[PDB]
Design a protein around this ligand. Structure first.
Ligand SMILES: OC[C@H]1O[C@H](O[C@H]2[C@H](O)[C@@H](O)[C@@H](O[C@H]3[C@H](O)[C@@H](O)[C@@H](O[C@H]4[C@H](O)[C@@H](O)[C@@H](O)O[C@@H]4CO)O[C@@H]3CO)O[C@@H]2CO)[C@H](O)[C@@H](O)[C@@H]1O
Ligand SMILES: OC[C@H]1O[C@H](O[C@H]2[C@H](O)[C@@H](O)[C@@H](O[C@H]3[C@H](O)[C@@H](O)[C@@H](O[C@H]4[C@H](O)[C@@H](O)[C@@H](O)O[C@@H]4CO)O[C@@H]3CO)O[C@@H]2CO)[C@H](O)[C@@H](O)[C@@H]1O
Ligand SMILES: OC[C@H]1O[C@H](O[C@H]2[C@H](O)[C@@H](O)[C@@H](O[C@H]3[C@H](O)[C@@H](O)[C@@H](O)O[C@@H]3CO)O[C@@H]2CO)[C@H](O)[C@@H](O)[C@@H]1O
Ligand SMILES: [Ca+2]
Length: 854
């Protein structure tokens, strides 16, 4: 309901009114009040601490609450303020933090002879714990908790260990205008019964929950010398093994599939890892809503039936959509409890298997040379309110963990039920959760979904806390833990309205990565929410119009790409296409923001593809001329991935980039099932032409999709898929062949990286990037590379051979990179350098890497 006033401190209420009284009713009877308190205007106004925490109400009038008021009692009541007649509810987070900020133990604490439970519920009238013996059995016992400063607690005997439980919370819910008895899980849960119906009272440190040699994992972690050595591969746990016939049927789709060391999927990851891939980013793997943890409840359509339907038919999606709410599939961006592994990915959803198997997965990946990144989703909740298994946080302290507008309505810009990390206990829970995953599961990094919705102070505190973990004290080397996220700035958090948020610009100089949407859009063309047929640097703009000024548009995109290739730095200086020398931050995007915004290459996550939006293969198939062969499109796929793999900064690959993965042009496949998200590690298909994708997100584009999906010339064969994989692995090998591709500082990049095809007379469709190392005695720089003294990369998107003469690079000892001399691709082997003129000759649609050997 309507809540326009804010209770910001124990003694201050803020309200934007041009006499004011506070009314309270413990029974929610409001006439009907048990308390009436006149508020006096506070001539001192709002303190600086209040305006800093809640900038959007800095203009509001301040009213003093008399110190004789029992604030702790009143916050448990139905409350209104009235002006003299305007009446409105009160938003309590400010006063709840001021009075009841709590840093003590929450959830379960185990000592030698006892177990304690602590729940933060300062607005609750009563809290009990209901114990169950077993995940499905009836209640065995109820015990009352005692309150101190808004925290409810009880201490019991050690025998309480491994019971299941829920909290019975009597609390006022504004959405129902009643004090309701709510049955709630523990926000600090570390395990659950199926679907989070009950919390398992488990000691996360219990030795039987640790796989063999778990405590020695630190010794077995893959080497990571620098964050600048990171490459990331983004993978969904179910996608990985759902279709993998080399994994036993009962272990497909979950954590256990990673324990099959010689499966097609694991052999695929070993191949990438051995080539130099360092990190695998797993899509949400905590307790999310939308998939039943009980596998026998899953509905699946028969894939053999779906395979009989025409390639451009709407029948496949109709079938999938009919049961998409009851199938095994979701990306999982629907948070319920952050600190527990998803039950649907475990062999048994009740109790220990989800803990052990998660740990086994981390161990398995580490032992094949891959560090593990978790996709963490702290920006919103699946559900709010007092009802249902899927609401926990807002069930216990309504209106606190969620961000609300100035009328008191929940903000939904993230998707639904935005969180308010600006509130003390939300911040606490986020950081506590991160430490849980880092310490209890030895996770190597975190990707923050909608980091722009998270306060920068939360991000920086998390970074500090994680980075200071040690092997001696905590079992993990915190100094190697890497953080990155989506720094999009929109809706209610834009322009720092709720405080300094984790936007791209605000995270410059923090050492926390953000996705570079500039290089993505310049390469592919347009934007995910723009015209689908708008072409870019690598999809035929100017050079190969699709038929649905452009020389200058192409050159503008080339400038944006080059800033990205040099780590997307604010201060890197480029000769722009007009001839003027410009800093990365002085080259602007179409919406007026600086292209280059980082202080370091480690703050840039360079990508052309991810789980969101169309796959690399699909975007290329939509934007390029219809007349191109699939053979040509395969080369274009390789060019895009190579621009990432040979960029300064941190390359990010979508799982399947390397094997032409399609989703039949689905732009948002979160609930599109295994059918549209198929990862085929037999390499027989890429999943192109499996029907029109679900109407929900795609129907407006079906007319462009249908003819392409139906055209057999668009579909690659196994040969194309294997060719893509081989060349992908080669370019990875090249990145890790020389530290020059992975410079660690902006200073190094400004000193060493130069672009050689620039200015108003630049050759369209070609980027030439040179990287210098020390050469000769008493050099101007340190020697980073023992094998090569100089590297030159030529990206040629033209459909014809090009010869680039660079006088600066003439009379040197350049050769084609040994990996490319040794390539299975016939075209790249034809690449050549001629010293007399410094001429680099590169075939059409090819990336050629040249080295000067020592
Ligand atoms: O198979 C028989 C061999 O068994 C033993 O070696 C194993 C290791 O025990 C495994 O853990 C693994 O280790 C490899 C890993 O597969 C490989 O990717 C690479 O790891 C790199 C990583 O890729 C890279 O990103 C970088 O950052 O650091 C990692 C190294 O820290 O190298 C690992 C080996 O060092 O596989 C090998 C088999 O290759 C046993 O020791 C051998 O004697 C035996 O032959
Ligand atoms: O939350 C529900 C929605 O979630 C998913 O949307 C994602 C997109 O898939 C991502 O691409 C991203 O969107 C970013 C975008 O990547 C980024 O470039 C930026 O785009 C702006 C652009 O800078 C600007 O010039 C202009 O053209 O508008 C663009 C979009 O407004 O910002 C986007 C975020 O605002 O993140 C979102 C998450 O919201 C999903 O695909 C959707 O179906 C779903 O609705
Ligand atoms: O179901 C009611 C719910 O509908 C609306 O939220 C939906 C989004 O509109 C929809 O896009 C989808 O969001 C997912 C993204 O598509 C996906 O890319 C990824 O980011 O995960 C998102 C969450 O799963 O689903 C939600 C939920 O159905 C509406 O905005 C809500 O207010 C409303 O409650
Ligand atoms: Ca589903």
């Amino acid at each position: 309901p309507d809540a326009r006033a804010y209770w910001v401190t124990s003694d201050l209420i803020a309200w934007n009114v041009g006499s004011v009284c506070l009314y309270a009713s413990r029974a929610a009877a409001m006439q009907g009040y048990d308390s009436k308190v006149e508020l006096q205007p506070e001539s001192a106004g709002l303190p600086e601490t209040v305006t800093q925490k809640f900038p959007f109400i800095s203009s509001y009038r301040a009213f003093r609450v008399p110190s004789s008021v029992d604030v702790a009692s009143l916050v448990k009541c139905q409350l209104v303020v009235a002006s003299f007649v305007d009446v409105t509810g009160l938003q309590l987070p400010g006063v709840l933090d001021d009075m009841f900020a709590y840093t003590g133990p929450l959830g379960a604490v185990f000592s030698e002879d006892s177990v304690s439970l602590h729940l933060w519920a300062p607005t609750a009238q009563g809290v009990s714990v209901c114990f169950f013996d077993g995940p499905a059995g009836p209640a065995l016992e109820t015990v009352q908790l005692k309150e101190s400063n808004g925290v409810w607690s009880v201490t019991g005997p050690r025998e309480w260990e491994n019971r299941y439980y829920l909290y019975e919370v009597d609390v006022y819910h504004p959405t129902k205008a009643q004090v309701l008895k709510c049955l709630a899980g523990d926000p600090y849960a570390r395990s659950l019964s199926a679907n989070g119906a009950r919390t398992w009272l488990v000691d996360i440190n219990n030795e039987t929950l640790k796989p063999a040699s778990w405590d020695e994992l630190a010794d077995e972690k893959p080497k990571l010398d620098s964050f600048s050595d990171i490459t990331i591969y983004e993978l969904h746990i179910r996608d990985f093994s759902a279709h993998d016939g080399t994994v036993d049927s009962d272990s497909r789709g979950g954590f256990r599939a990673f324990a099959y060391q010689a499966s097609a999927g694991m052999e695929h990851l070993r191949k990438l890892s051995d080539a130099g891939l360092t990190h695998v980013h797993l899509l949400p793997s905590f307790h999310f809503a939308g998939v039943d943890d009980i596998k026998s409840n899953w509905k699946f359509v028969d894939e053999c039936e779906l395979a009989t339907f025409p390639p451009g038919s709407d029948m496949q999606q109709a079938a999938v959509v009919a049961i998409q709410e009851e199938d095994p599939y979701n990306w999982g961006y629907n948070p319920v409890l952050w600190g527990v592994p998803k039950g649907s990915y475990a062999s048994d959803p009740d109790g220990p298997s989800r803990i052990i198997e998660y740990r086994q997965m981390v161990q398995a990946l580490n032992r094949i040379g891959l560090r593990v990144v978790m996709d963490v989703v702290y920006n919103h909740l699946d559900s709010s309110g007092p009802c249902g298994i899927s609401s926990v946080l807002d069930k216990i302290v309504p209106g606190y963990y969620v961000r609300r507008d100035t009328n008191g309505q929940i903000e939904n810009s993230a998707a639904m039920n935005n969180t308010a990390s600006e509130h003390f206990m939300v911040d606490r829970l986020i950081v506590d959760d991160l430490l849980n995953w880092a310490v209890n599961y030895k996770v190597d990094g975190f990707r923050f979904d909608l980091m722009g919705h998270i306060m920068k102070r939360t991000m920086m505190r998390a970074k500090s806390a994680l980075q200071s973990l040690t092997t001696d004290a905590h079992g993990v080397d915190g100094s190697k833990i890497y953080l990155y996220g989506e720094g999009w700035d929109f809706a209610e958090v834009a322009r720092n309205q709720r405080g300094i948020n984790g936007s791209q610009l605000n995270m410059s100089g923090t050492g926390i990565g953000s996705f570079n949407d500039r290089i993505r859009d310049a390469i592919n063309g347009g934007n995910p929410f723009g015209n689908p047929l708008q072409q870019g640097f690598n999809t035929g703009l100017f050079l190969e119009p699709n038929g649905f000024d452009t020389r200058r548009s192409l050159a503008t995109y080339a400038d944006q790409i080059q800033i990205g290739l040099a780590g997307n730095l604010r201060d890197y200086v480029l000769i722009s296409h007009t001839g003027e020398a410009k800093k990365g931050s002085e080259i602007h995007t179409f919406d007026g923001l600086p292209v280059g915004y980082t202080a370091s290459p480690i703050e840039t996550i360079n990508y052309v593809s991810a789980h969101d939006n169309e796959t690399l293969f699909d975007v290329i198939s939509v934007k390029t001329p219809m007349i191109l062969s699939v053979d040509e499109r395969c080369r274009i796929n390789h060019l895009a991935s190579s621009m990432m793999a040979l960029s300064q900064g941190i390359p990010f690959f979508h799982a399947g980039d390397e094997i032409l993965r399609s989703k039949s042009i689905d732009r948002d496949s979160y609930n599109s099932g295994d059918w549209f998200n198929k990862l085929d590690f037999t390499y027989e298909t890429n999943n192109w032409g499996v029907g029109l994708p679900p109407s929900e997100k795609n129907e407006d584009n079906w007319p462009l999709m249908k003819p392409r999906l139906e055209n057999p010339s668009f579909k690659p064969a196994k040969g194309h898929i294997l060719a893509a994989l081989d060349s992908f692995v080669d370019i990875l090998k090249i990145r890790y062949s020389s530290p020059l591709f992975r410079l660690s500082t902006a200073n190094d990049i400004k000193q060493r990286v130069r672009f050689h095809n620039t200015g108003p007379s630049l050759v369209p469709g070609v980027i030439v990037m040179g990287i210098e190392d020390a050469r000769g005695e008493s050099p101007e720089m340190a020697q980073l590379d023992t094998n090569f003294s100089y590297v030159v990369t030529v990206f040629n998107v033209c459909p014809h051979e090009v010869s680039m003469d660079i006088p600066a690079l003439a009379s040197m000892g350049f050769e084609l990179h040994p990996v490319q001399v040794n390539s299975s691709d016939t075209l790249v082997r034809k690449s050549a350098y001629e010293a007399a003129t410094g001429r680099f000759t590169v075939p059409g649609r090819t990336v050629s890497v040249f080295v000067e050997p020592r």
